[PDB]
Amino acid sequence: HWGYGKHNGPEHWHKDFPIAKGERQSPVDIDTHTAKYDPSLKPLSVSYDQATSLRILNNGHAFNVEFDDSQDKAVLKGGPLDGTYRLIQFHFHWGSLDGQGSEHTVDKKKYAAELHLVHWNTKYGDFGKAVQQPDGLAVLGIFLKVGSAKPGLQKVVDVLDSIKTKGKSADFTNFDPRGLLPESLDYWTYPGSLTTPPLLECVTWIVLKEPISVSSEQVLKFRKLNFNGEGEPEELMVDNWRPAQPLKNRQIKASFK
Ligand SMILES: NS(=O)(=O)c1ccc(NC(=O)Cc2cccs2)cc1
Ligand SMILES: [Zn+2]
């Protein structure tokens, strides 16, 4: 099946998922000089105060912190979005080295990792229906650079030992995703896709301009995870990122001057 190795990696995905070569694929390089300020873009509304985290899961491609999305508890609104998008999970992509790991790039610069907070449009009833719609998902992307520790990330780091291998999960309640945000909510936005198979073209991407900083020890713990299941040959979960795809007929808009 698909993955991030030499034989099943991003260059191979198109054979099972032809949309890999589609018109609105993600991630992309954000050329800061070509992005256009859109003064009509509304401020982002991040309402995470009632967030209910449930569980953390190693799915063999990344780890997801999952949320109760059966009510409007943690929602994203505003910005380029019409309507209400519920937080269903977040996860990260990261590198084997600090100089790579992010999926989006900024003027070709790669960050050490990238956080994706995944939300779905409530007008479609459930996540499975939403991914079938061009405005079904909104993913808030946040870059990570290595420097000072991110205190709000530490709870996540400390449970990773319990979900080392594919298919392992652990209770993960009472986690506050607000602790993963940078100070500024200035963003770029463009229409795009899931960055892993099935690569569905259903995502409004909202990528924050300001990265968060995490410590070397924090990212090192990400890199101790495994792609494999328990009792299979050990393959470190690193470099689980798709490279930038062609922008094609799209304009990246900026919320800031
Ligand atoms: N890296 S990303 O674009 O944020 C992303 C988010 C979610 C998924 N996949 C799923 O949530 C699982 C799916 C269920 C039904 C269709 S895809 C893949 C990539
Ligand atoms: Zn992702």
Tab-separated table of C-alpha atoms and ligand atoms in Angstrom:
chain	number	residue	atom	x	y	z
A	1	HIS	CA	0.000	0.000	0.000
A	2	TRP	CA	0.980	3.661	-0.151
A	3	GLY	CA	3.455	5.290	2.190
A	4	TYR	CA	6.575	7.437	2.155
A	5	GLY	CA	9.262	4.979	1.088
A	6	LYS	CA	11.215	4.738	-2.157
A	7	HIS	CA	8.814	2.151	-3.525
A	8	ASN	CA	5.441	3.459	-2.284
A	9	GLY	CA	6.086	7.178	-1.797
A	10	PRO	CA	4.582	10.355	-3.286
A	11	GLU	CA	5.967	9.663	-6.794
A	12	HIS	CA	3.951	6.416	-6.857
A	13	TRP	CA	0.629	7.614	-5.510
A	14	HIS	CA	-0.842	8.585	-8.881
A	15	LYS	CA	-1.087	4.930	-9.964
A	16	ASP	CA	-3.732	4.161	-7.309
A	17	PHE	CA	-4.938	7.767	-6.938
A	18	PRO	CA	-4.928	9.483	-10.332
A	19	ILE	CA	-6.177	12.717	-8.717
A	20	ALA	CA	-2.586	13.024	-7.480
A	21	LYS	CA	-2.015	14.882	-10.758
A	22	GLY	CA	-5.204	16.948	-10.453
A	23	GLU	CA	-5.929	20.659	-10.692
A	24	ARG	CA	-5.962	21.576	-6.987
A	25	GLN	CA	-3.392	19.388	-5.220
A	26	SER	CA	-1.660	20.129	-1.909
A	27	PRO	CA	0.708	21.070	-0.474
A	28	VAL	CA	2.162	23.957	-2.494
A	29	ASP	CA	4.987	26.444	-2.213
A	30	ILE	CA	3.770	29.792	-0.904
A	31	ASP	CA	5.553	32.464	-2.891
A	32	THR	CA	5.184	35.390	-0.505
A	33	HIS	CA	5.817	37.995	-3.165
A	34	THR	CA	3.158	36.564	-5.509
A	35	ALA	CA	0.449	35.996	-2.888
A	36	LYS	CA	-2.108	38.801	-2.981
A	37	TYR	CA	-3.478	40.644	0.014
A	38	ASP	CA	-7.271	40.339	0.000
A	39	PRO	CA	-8.623	43.141	2.206
A	40	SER	CA	-12.071	41.517	2.078
A	41	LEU	CA	-10.825	38.398	3.906
A	42	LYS	CA	-12.393	38.304	7.364
A	43	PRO	CA	-10.372	37.551	10.488
A	44	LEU	CA	-10.188	33.871	11.397
A	45	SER	CA	-12.438	32.759	14.229
A	46	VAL	CA	-10.910	29.934	16.258
A	47	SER	CA	-13.312	28.762	18.963
A	48	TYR	CA	-11.663	25.915	20.839
A	49	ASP	CA	-12.781	26.652	24.401
A	50	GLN	CA	-15.199	23.692	24.535
A	51	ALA	CA	-12.904	21.266	22.720
A	52	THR	CA	-13.247	17.634	23.794
A	53	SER	CA	-10.236	15.522	22.889
A	54	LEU	CA	-10.771	11.778	23.108
A	55	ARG	CA	-7.886	9.660	21.916
A	56	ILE	CA	-4.507	9.633	20.197
A	57	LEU	CA	-3.854	7.085	17.443
A	58	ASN	CA	-0.816	5.950	15.464
A	59	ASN	CA	-2.353	5.156	12.055
A	60	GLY	CA	0.873	4.113	10.354
A	61	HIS	CA	1.300	7.447	8.536
A	62	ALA	CA	1.185	9.942	11.392
A	63	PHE	CA	-0.498	10.228	14.797
A	64	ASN	CA	-3.919	11.833	15.176
A	65	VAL	CA	-5.356	13.462	18.242
A	66	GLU	CA	-9.097	12.920	17.775
A	67	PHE	CA	-11.960	15.069	19.054
A	68	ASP	CA	-15.675	14.703	19.724
A	69	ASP	CA	-17.180	16.307	16.620
A	70	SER	CA	-20.798	15.278	17.263
A	71	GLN	CA	-21.600	18.811	18.484
A	72	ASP	CA	-20.261	22.299	17.785
A	73	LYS	CA	-17.572	22.188	20.498
A	74	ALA	CA	-14.390	23.285	18.733
A	75	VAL	CA	-15.024	25.160	15.519
A	76	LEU	CA	-13.325	27.255	12.902
A	77	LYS	CA	-15.224	30.063	11.160
A	78	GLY	CA	-14.507	33.311	9.330
A	79	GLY	CA	-11.473	33.942	7.179
A	80	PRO	CA	-12.288	32.650	3.673
A	81	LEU	CA	-14.894	30.254	5.076
A	82	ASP	CA	-18.659	30.318	4.785
A	83	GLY	CA	-20.362	28.471	7.613
A	84	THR	CA	-19.062	26.396	10.498
A	85	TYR	CA	-16.254	23.831	10.410
A	86	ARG	CA	-15.851	21.360	13.298
A	87	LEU	CA	-12.488	20.141	14.542
A	88	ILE	CA	-12.231	16.368	14.098
A	89	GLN	CA	-8.500	15.735	14.589
A	90	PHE	CA	-5.031	17.195	14.414
A	91	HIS	CA	-1.751	15.614	13.365
A	92	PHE	CA	1.730	16.561	12.194
A	93	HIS	CA	4.155	15.861	9.368
A	94	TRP	CA	7.860	15.977	10.208
A	95	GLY	CA	11.353	15.281	8.952
A	96	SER	CA	14.338	13.108	9.781
A	97	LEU	CA	16.355	16.340	10.043
A	98	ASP	CA	15.440	19.834	11.285
A	99	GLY	CA	15.895	21.217	7.760
A	100	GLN	CA	12.881	19.398	6.337
A	101	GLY	CA	9.503	18.054	7.368
A	102	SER	CA	6.859	20.578	6.418
A	103	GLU	CA	4.523	19.994	3.500
A	104	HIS	CA	3.880	23.602	2.565
A	105	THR	CA	6.970	25.676	1.978
A	106	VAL	CA	7.396	29.449	2.104
A	107	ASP	CA	9.578	30.879	-0.660
A	108	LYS	CA	10.871	27.293	-0.964
A	109	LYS	CA	11.837	27.229	2.727
A	110	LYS	CA	11.077	23.953	4.508
A	111	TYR	CA	10.191	23.936	8.215
A	112	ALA	CA	10.994	21.106	10.656
A	113	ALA	CA	7.362	20.024	10.808
A	114	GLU	CA	3.813	21.132	10.079
A	115	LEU	CA	0.699	20.840	12.233
A	116	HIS	CA	-2.672	20.217	10.551
A	117	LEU	CA	-5.874	20.930	12.430
A	118	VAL	CA	-8.556	19.240	10.359
A	119	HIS	CA	-12.147	20.605	10.318
A	120	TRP	CA	-15.264	19.668	8.333
A	121	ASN	CA	-18.177	21.762	7.082
A	122	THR	CA	-21.225	21.012	9.265
A	123	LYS	CA	-23.608	21.561	6.353
A	124	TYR	CA	-22.542	18.128	5.084
A	125	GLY	CA	-23.519	16.191	8.208
A	126	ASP	CA	-20.442	13.999	8.659
A	127	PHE	CA	-16.752	13.876	7.727
A	128	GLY	CA	-17.234	11.139	5.141
A	129	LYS	CA	-19.757	13.243	3.220
A	130	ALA	CA	-17.684	16.391	3.617
A	131	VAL	CA	-14.583	14.997	1.908
A	132	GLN	CA	-16.711	14.494	-1.210
A	133	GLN	CA	-17.367	18.251	-1.509
A	134	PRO	CA	-15.122	21.015	-2.892
A	135	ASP	CA	-15.754	23.080	0.274
A	136	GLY	CA	-15.970	20.133	2.638
A	137	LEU	CA	-12.878	20.608	4.795
A	138	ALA	CA	-10.840	23.435	6.235
A	139	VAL	CA	-7.364	22.568	7.414
A	140	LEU	CA	-5.450	25.028	9.552
A	141	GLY	CA	-1.733	24.538	8.911
A	142	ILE	CA	0.907	25.764	11.325
A	143	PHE	CA	4.643	25.545	10.767
A	144	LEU	CA	7.025	24.264	13.438
A	145	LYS	CA	10.609	25.443	13.765
A	146	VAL	CA	13.164	24.086	16.216
A	147	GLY	CA	14.078	26.464	19.053
A	148	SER	CA	12.405	26.915	22.433
A	149	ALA	CA	9.984	24.240	23.648
A	150	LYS	CA	6.240	24.623	23.078
A	151	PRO	CA	4.738	23.989	26.530
A	152	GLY	CA	1.317	23.186	25.074
A	153	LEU	CA	2.821	20.385	22.980
A	154	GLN	CA	4.422	18.518	25.850
A	155	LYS	CA	1.365	16.451	26.821
A	156	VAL	CA	1.327	15.109	23.263
A	157	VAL	CA	5.059	14.351	23.314
A	158	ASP	CA	4.776	12.463	26.593
A	159	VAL	CA	2.111	9.998	25.422
A	160	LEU	CA	3.965	8.979	22.234
A	161	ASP	CA	5.745	6.121	24.030
A	162	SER	CA	2.329	4.497	24.437
A	163	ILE	CA	1.488	4.577	20.701
A	164	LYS	CA	4.851	3.688	19.198
A	165	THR	CA	3.568	1.389	16.460
A	166	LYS	CA	0.822	1.324	13.842
A	167	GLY	CA	-2.646	0.623	15.223
A	168	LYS	CA	-1.880	1.623	18.812
A	169	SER	CA	-4.148	4.159	20.509
A	170	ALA	CA	-4.389	5.730	23.950
A	171	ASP	CA	-6.952	7.747	25.879
A	172	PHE	CA	-6.171	11.443	25.419
A	173	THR	CA	-8.826	13.520	27.118
A	174	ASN	CA	-8.818	17.128	28.271
A	175	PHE	CA	-6.180	18.297	25.816
A	176	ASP	CA	-6.439	21.975	24.871
A	177	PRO	CA	-5.441	22.606	21.237
A	178	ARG	CA	-5.258	26.367	21.898
A	179	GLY	CA	-1.815	25.643	23.373
A	180	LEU	CA	-0.523	24.809	19.886
A	181	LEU	CA	-1.330	28.185	18.271
A	182	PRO	CA	1.093	31.022	17.559
A	183	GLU	CA	0.273	34.572	18.707
A	184	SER	CA	-0.816	35.883	15.319
A	185	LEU	CA	-3.613	34.461	13.176
A	186	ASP	CA	-2.379	36.136	9.942
A	187	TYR	CA	-2.714	33.551	7.180
A	188	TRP	CA	-2.464	32.577	3.527
A	189	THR	CA	-5.344	30.675	1.939
A	190	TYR	CA	-5.922	28.666	-1.242
A	191	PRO	CA	-8.120	25.795	-2.464
A	192	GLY	CA	-6.401	22.433	-2.280
A	193	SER	CA	-6.543	18.779	-1.318
A	194	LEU	CA	-5.790	16.171	1.314
A	195	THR	CA	-2.013	15.722	1.253
A	196	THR	CA	-2.192	11.936	1.572
A	197	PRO	CA	-4.241	9.424	-0.352
A	198	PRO	CA	-7.051	9.567	-1.259
A	199	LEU	CA	-5.850	13.118	-2.108
A	200	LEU	CA	-9.435	14.376	-2.398
A	201	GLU	CA	-9.814	17.942	-3.621
A	202	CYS	CA	-12.013	19.056	-0.760
A	203	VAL	CA	-9.871	21.364	1.380
A	204	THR	CA	-9.774	25.088	1.963
A	205	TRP	CA	-6.219	25.515	3.212
A	206	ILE	CA	-5.531	28.179	5.800
A	207	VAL	CA	-1.806	28.329	6.556
A	208	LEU	CA	-0.615	30.599	9.375
A	209	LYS	CA	2.248	32.992	8.655
A	210	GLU	CA	3.750	32.716	12.140
A	211	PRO	CA	5.421	29.393	13.009
A	212	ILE	CA	5.470	27.957	16.504
A	213	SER	CA	8.758	26.874	18.023
A	214	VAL	CA	9.289	23.414	19.497
A	215	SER	CA	12.404	22.071	21.174
A	216	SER	CA	14.883	19.653	19.662
A	217	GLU	CA	13.867	17.157	22.369
A	218	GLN	CA	10.218	17.502	21.365
A	219	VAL	CA	10.776	16.822	17.657
A	220	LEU	CA	13.257	14.043	18.513
A	221	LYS	CA	10.404	12.242	20.263
A	222	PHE	CA	8.265	12.466	17.094
A	223	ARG	CA	11.094	10.676	15.275
A	224	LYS	CA	11.045	7.703	17.666
A	225	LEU	CA	7.605	6.662	16.445
A	226	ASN	CA	7.273	3.725	14.034
A	227	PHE	CA	5.449	3.364	10.684
A	228	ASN	CA	5.278	-0.388	11.252
A	229	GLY	CA	3.087	-2.446	13.554
A	230	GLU	CA	4.377	-4.166	16.689
A	231	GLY	CA	6.414	-7.260	15.833
A	232	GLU	CA	7.175	-6.077	12.302
A	233	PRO	CA	10.593	-4.757	11.219
A	234	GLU	CA	11.185	-1.317	12.739
A	235	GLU	CA	10.903	1.642	10.384
A	236	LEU	CA	11.140	5.059	12.034
A	237	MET	CA	8.215	7.369	11.325
A	238	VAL	CA	10.111	10.265	9.782
A	239	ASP	CA	9.758	12.221	6.536
A	240	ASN	CA	6.024	11.619	6.346
A	241	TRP	CA	5.497	14.681	4.154
A	242	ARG	CA	4.419	15.166	0.555
A	243	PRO	CA	6.501	17.685	-1.398
A	244	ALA	CA	5.064	20.840	-2.958
A	245	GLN	CA	2.787	20.274	-5.973
A	246	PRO	CA	2.189	22.548	-8.983
A	247	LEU	CA	-0.001	25.591	-8.207
A	248	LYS	CA	-1.651	25.429	-11.625
A	249	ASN	CA	-4.682	27.697	-11.966
A	250	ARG	CA	-4.731	28.988	-8.381
A	251	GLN	CA	-3.988	32.234	-6.557
A	252	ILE	CA	-2.813	32.205	-2.958
A	253	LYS	CA	-4.453	35.026	-0.993
A	254	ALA	CA	-2.999	36.716	2.093
A	255	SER	CA	-4.976	38.082	5.045
A	256	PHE	CA	-2.258	40.615	5.825
A	257	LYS	CA	-0.198	43.298	4.099
B	1	LIG	N1	-2.673	15.851	5.647
B	1	LIG	S1	-4.218	16.330	5.532
B	1	LIG	O1	-4.484	16.940	4.251
B	1	LIG	O2	-4.584	17.250	6.572
B	1	LIG	C1	-5.231	14.897	5.681
B	1	LIG	C2	-6.308	14.854	6.562
B	1	LIG	C3	-7.086	13.701	6.633
B	1	LIG	C4	-6.777	12.608	5.825
B	1	LIG	N2	-7.503	11.374	5.813
B	1	LIG	C5	-8.633	11.040	6.617
B	1	LIG	O3	-9.119	11.816	7.418
B	1	LIG	C6	-9.228	9.685	6.422
B	1	LIG	C7	-10.320	9.644	5.414
B	1	LIG	C8	-11.615	9.171	5.595
B	1	LIG	C9	-12.440	9.272	4.486
B	1	LIG	C10	-11.854	9.820	3.353
B	1	LIG	S2	-10.240	10.204	3.791
B	1	LIG	C11	-5.704	12.669	4.956
B	1	LIG	C12	-4.936	13.811	4.880
B	2	ZN	ZN	-1.685	16.510	7.252
